[PDB]
Design a protein around this ligand. Structure first.
Ligand SMILES: CC(C)=CCC/C(C)=C/CC/C(C)=C/CSP(=O)(O)OP(=O)(O)O
Ligand SMILES: CC(C)=CCC/C(C)=C/CC/C(C)=C/CSP(=O)(O)OP(=O)(O)O
Ligand SMILES: [Mg+2]
Ligand SMILES: [Mg+2]
Lengths: 229, 229
């Protein structure tokens, strides 16, 4: 089963949860919880359609400025998702990775992440990347610091640093490159998501809100990609 | 006269010249020449509508693999544009900058670029950035090399490198951030253009081909931006 319409790595900006809840007179957190159901659905769709990697923008590094309470509810939802879906991810041969600066998360959450990555580390099917406390510029900077060290250590000359070398130091360099970025919610921006990695990616924007994003919507983005002529 | 709909810095991926010429039974070079007329028109529109900076993707660093003859014709068109439009740019108070690796261009062209930037260096109206032999990853790497040197020199510690610091070392860091990216030609990709810089930019894609892009088209992208809600 070759990647749906030949799409290897899909990345998604899951926006629109607040508006989806507000339209119904409910608070944003209600929308974030329904967004977790769309996550389940997108993950299943990707793993059943030969996609090699699915990368989800779950918590931008700029979301720390949102209402204290909304942030806490997000962190509890993350904990809850780890506790509740990891066994199924494992049974489905999905390898779980969290990308972003996890050092900023609480203990309980950091431990669950490390435990969930360990358990699925040897899985060979879909790789599911959850971008949490992630930013594209931060990602590039982490790689830059890694090369800066080598320079400090005398193991690398400034004139030796090139694109390929930094590329081997940004997140997900071990996976196929991002082929398609999908952003739900109607906004036409990348909002600091995978900047280095989306250099040659198709970009697909839909007004559909994340909680309503379903299998037909995902197939539509795949068809859009297949016709990327 | 405040930036059209409050848009300070517009960047454009001027695609579609080959298809525009082919539709008429003509060769790509014919389309590139007509694209130069659309450049004149976009520049005039930006300078007359309070835009602070207009950045045009004129020659990607990956276009070196195009047909030898098409590449040469592009280089002659660049030379020709410098020779022919610089006096008017100057009279219009436009500051000209070329971003990208100019060391790879021929002598005549390198000299004309340096001369044209010098003549307009003290202009204060629109800043026109022509991205020639430019790539977004290359741009970030040039900044990384600048910081790597400082590390080599013992003037900087790896742990001191952060986003703001690298930001002060990528192209156009002295100008307002890119607010809007327009890509003509129908493809929905960024194709290695301003990656670091487009983190928070609105992205506007149109099927209109670059040679046909006119003032009404540009106003439409501006209206799209104004309604970026
Ligand atoms: C289980 C798991 C790992 C993830 C699922 C939880 C979700 C959906 C996370 C993304 C939430 C954020 C910060 C969304 C942008 S929606 P928004 O709050 O910006 O909504 P809005 O733009 O106001 O309409
Ligand atoms: C005066 C000046 C500084 C610039 C104007 C010259 C132009 C229009 C330069 C951009 C040309 C390129 C490499 C365009 C993509 S069009 P394409 O050739 O990819 O066409 P296609 O995709 O095949 O339809
Ligand atoms: Mg949002
Ligand atoms: Mg093209």
């Amino acid at each position: 089963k070759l990647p749906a319409h030949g799409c290897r790595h899909v990345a998604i900006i899951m926006d629109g949860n607040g508006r989806w809840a507000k339209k119904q007179g409910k608070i944003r957190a209600f929308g974030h919880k329904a967004g977790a159901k769309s996550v389940r659905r997108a993950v299943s769709f990707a793993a059943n359609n030969g996609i090699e990697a699915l990368t989800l923008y779950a918590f931008s590094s700029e979301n720390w400025n949102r209402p204290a309470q909304e942030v806490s509810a997000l962190m509890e939802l993350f904990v809850w998702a780890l506790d509740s879906e990891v066994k199924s991810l494992h049974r489905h041969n999905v390898r779980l990775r969290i990308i972003g600066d996890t050092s900023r998360f609480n203990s309980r959450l950091q431990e669950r992440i490390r435990k969930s990555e360990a358990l699925t580390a040897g899985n060979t099917g879909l790789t599911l990347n959850i971008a949490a406390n992630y930013g594209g510029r931060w990602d590039i900077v982490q790689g830059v610091r890694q090369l800066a060290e080598k320079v400090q250590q005398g193991n690398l000359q400034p004139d030796q640093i090139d694109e390929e070398m930094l590329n081997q130091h940004v997140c997900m360099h071990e996976l196929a490159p991002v082929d398609l970025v999908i952003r739900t919610g109607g906004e036409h921006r990348i909002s600091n998501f995978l900047l280095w990695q989306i250099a040659y990616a198709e970009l697909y924007f839909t007004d559909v809100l994340w909680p309503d994003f379903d299998e037909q919507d995902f197939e539509g983005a795949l068809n859009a990609f297949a016709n990327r002529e």
